[PDB]
C-alpha cells in the first residue's frame, strides 16, 4: 500500500466488488507499488493500517509516523503450502516447517479429470471433506474445492496404551 | 482447476525451478581470510546478459 | 502441485532464514533434507 495525509479506502474497496457480479485499478491509480528487496531498504511500513496510527494478543506499538507504506495483510509471507496451517501464530516454528512439507505427502482429490487422465501411480480419497478449520488464504489456493483430509472427530487421551 | 505452467515432454509433466544467483554486473567488497596477503577485494560480476 | 510450481533451487549462512527473506520465501516451508532452506518456496 501507500501512505500520505493511506491512499486506498472504502471508496476503492467497493471500487471493484461488482467484479464477480482490477489489480491494474490499484496500481495505475497510484494506490500501490512493486518494491523489490533492494528498494525495501529505503522505506517504512506499518504492519496493520488501523493498528499503527494514533485480554487479547498483547500487540506491537506504532511510534514514529514516518510511514511510507502499509502491509496488506501480514498473512501473505506464508508459503504456497504452509498457507494451510490452522493458526501457525500459535505453534513452534519447526512444527510449521513440517505440516508444511507434510500436506505435500498426503491423499486427496488431486485434479477432477482423475478418471480420464491416466498417469503412473496416483492416490484419490473416497470422501473428501472441506476442513472445519479454514484460513482466509485457502480461498485463493482453491482448497475447500479439492480438500486433502477429513474432519475426524478426535479425542485425545490414554486408553489401551496402543 | 488446472493452472498451467508446465511442459509436456514425451508425456510426463515436467517443471522448471528458479535457479537463483547473485545478480551480475554489481560491485561488492569482502575482507578476506586472516592469513591472506589481501585485506579486502572489489568484485564486479562482468557479464552482459 | 502449486508448491512445486513455486520452488527455487538455490545451487551450491545461505541456509538460514534471512532478514531480506521477508515476504518472498516462506518463513518455515523448506525441506528437512540435505538441502534444507536451500530450495526456498516462494
Amino acid at each position: 500500500f501507500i501512505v500520505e495525509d493511506l491512499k486506498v479506502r472504502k471508496g476503492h474497496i467497493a471500487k471493484l466488488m461488482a467484479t464477480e457480479y482490477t489489480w491494474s485499478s490499484l496500481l495505475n491509480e497510484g494506490l500501490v507499488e512493486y518494491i523489490d528487496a533492494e528498494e525495501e531498504e529505503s522505506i517504512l511500513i506499518a504492519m496493520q493500517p488501523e493498528d499503527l496510527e494514533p485480554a487479547k494478543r498483547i500487540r506491537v506499538s506504532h511510534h514514529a509516523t514516518t510511514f511510507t507504506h502499509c502491509e496488506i495483510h501480514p498473512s501473505m509471507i506464508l508459503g504456497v503450502a504452509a498457507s494451510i496451517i490452522p493458526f501457525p501464530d500459535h505453534n513452534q516454528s519447526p512444527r510449521n516447517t513440517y505440516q508444511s512439507a507434510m500436506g505435500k505427502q498426503a491423499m486427496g482429490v488431486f485434479l477432477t479429470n482423475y478418471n480420464v487422465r491416466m498417469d503412473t501411480m496416483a492416490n484419490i480419497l473416497y470422501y473428501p471433506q472441506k476442513p472445519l478449520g479454514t484460513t482466509r488464504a485457502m480461498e485463493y489456493l482453491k482448497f475447500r474445492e479439492l480438500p486433502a483430509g477429513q474432519n475426524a472427530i478426535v479425542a485425545i487421551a490414554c486408553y489401551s496404551g496402543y | 482447476f488446472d493452472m498451467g505452467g508446465y511442459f509436456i515432454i514425451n508425456g510426463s509433466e515436467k517443471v522448471l525451478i528458479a535457479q537463483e544467483r547473485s545478480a551480475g554486473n554489481i560491485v561488492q567488497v569482502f575482507k578476506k581470510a586472516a592469513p591472506s596477503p589481501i585485506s579486502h577485494v572489489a568484485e564486479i560480476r562482468s557479464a552482459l546478459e | 502441485t502449486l508448491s512445486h510450481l513455486r520452488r527455487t533451487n538455490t545451487p551450491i549462512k545461505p541456509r538460514q532464514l534471512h532478514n531480506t527473506h521477508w515476504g518472498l520465501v516462506c518463513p518455515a516451508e523448506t525441506p528437512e533434507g540435505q538441502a534444507c532452506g536451500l530450495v526456498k518456496n516462494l
Binding site: 479506502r9 472504502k10 471508496g11 474497496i13 493500517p49 496488506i72 495483510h73 501473505m76 485463493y140 | 493452472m3 | -
Partner: peptide, 30 residues
C-alpha cells in the same frame, strides 16, 4: 462514501483481486 478509510476485511477484497489478475503461477507463465 470514498472518504472512509480501510479496515482488515477491506484488504482481503484487495488480495482477492490480486490473483484474479495474476493467479497463482504468475511468474511462470509470464
Amino acid at each position: 462514501d470514498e472518504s472512509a478509510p480501510i479496515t482488515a476485511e477491506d484488504s482481503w477484497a484487495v488480495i482477492s483481486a490480486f490473483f484474479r489478475e495474476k493467479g497463482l503461477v504468475s511468474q511462470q507463465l509470464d
